[PDB]
């Protein structure tokens, strides 16, 4: 809940390295999500029934979404010091996924999980225990605001 100025800097600085290899990382994340937590695949018409990473990484639909996810995060990171703006971003997100896509909010949580897991595996020389703790705080914030919108919207 309390995010510090140093942590904020930890995040901006690590993210700059992650964004440099943005695309592969996006999909590495989504492939772990969809493989490890398969029911999460249910919302995606073109690969809901695909189990294999090599199959999944070739899905045009997977990849576009993986791209959208990362741009999302990037926006959230560019915007860390402006809290009204993170609020609207999470609002927009949460609405769409609630109303248009009908995604169970649990998957946002599980995704936050996977992002750490993959960040601090693909980019371990940067994601130190300390940096990981900051990303934790951030992603709990993301997930918390998403849930808040989901309730505003009528999901209980
Ligand atoms: C930080 C997390 C995420 C971000 C930034 C994100 C962003 C987006 C964006 C920008 C779109 C397209 C624009 C829109 O329709 O609103 C989209 C579509 C979608 N998202 Fe996400 N999303 C995220 C997480 C999730 C998660 C966890 C799921 C879980 C299954 C999911 C499922 C979908 C689906 C089903 C669509 C429709 C895409 C399609 O037509 O194939 N998203 N997302």
CA atoms within 13 A on the CB side of 53: 9
Q: How far apart are CA 125 and CA 114, in angstroms?
A: 18
Q: Does the annotation list 49 as a binding residue?
A: no
Give me the domains of the chain, ranges plus CATH numbers. 1-156 (1.10.490.10)
Cβ < 6 Å from ligand 1: which residues?
A: 40, 43-44, 61, 65, 68-69, 72, 93, 96-97, 100-101, 103, 107-108, 111
In ligand 1, the atom with minimum distance to the C-alpha of 110 is 27
Q: Give the technique used to solve this structure.
A: X-ray
Alpha carbons 91 and 2: distance in angstroms, whole number = 20
Question: Ligand 1 test: best mutation among 32, 97, 111, 149, most atoms within 8 Å of CB?
Answer: 97
- Angstrom resolution of this structure: 3.0
């Amino acid at each position: 809940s309390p995010l510090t100025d140093k942590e904020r800097v930890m995040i901006q600085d690590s993210w700059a390295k992650v964004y440099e290899n943005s695309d592969d990382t996006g999909v590495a994340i989504l492939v772990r999500l969809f493989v490890n937590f398969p029911s999460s695949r249910q919302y995606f018409s073109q690969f809901k029934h695909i189990e294999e990473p090599e199959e999944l990484e070739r899905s045009a639909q997977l990849r576009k979404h993986a791209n959208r996810v990362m741009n999302g995060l990037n926006t959230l990171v560019e915007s860390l010091d402006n809290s009204e703006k993170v609020a609207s971003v999470l609002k927009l997100l949460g609405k769409a996924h609630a109303l248009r896509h009908k995604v169970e909010p649990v998957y946002f949580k599980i995704l936050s999980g996977v992002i750490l897991e993959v960040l601090g595996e693909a980019f371990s020389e940067v994601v130190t225990p300390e940096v990981a703790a900051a990303w934790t705080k951030l992603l709990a914030t993301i997930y918390s605001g998403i849930n808040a919108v989901y309730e505003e919207v009528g999901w209980s």
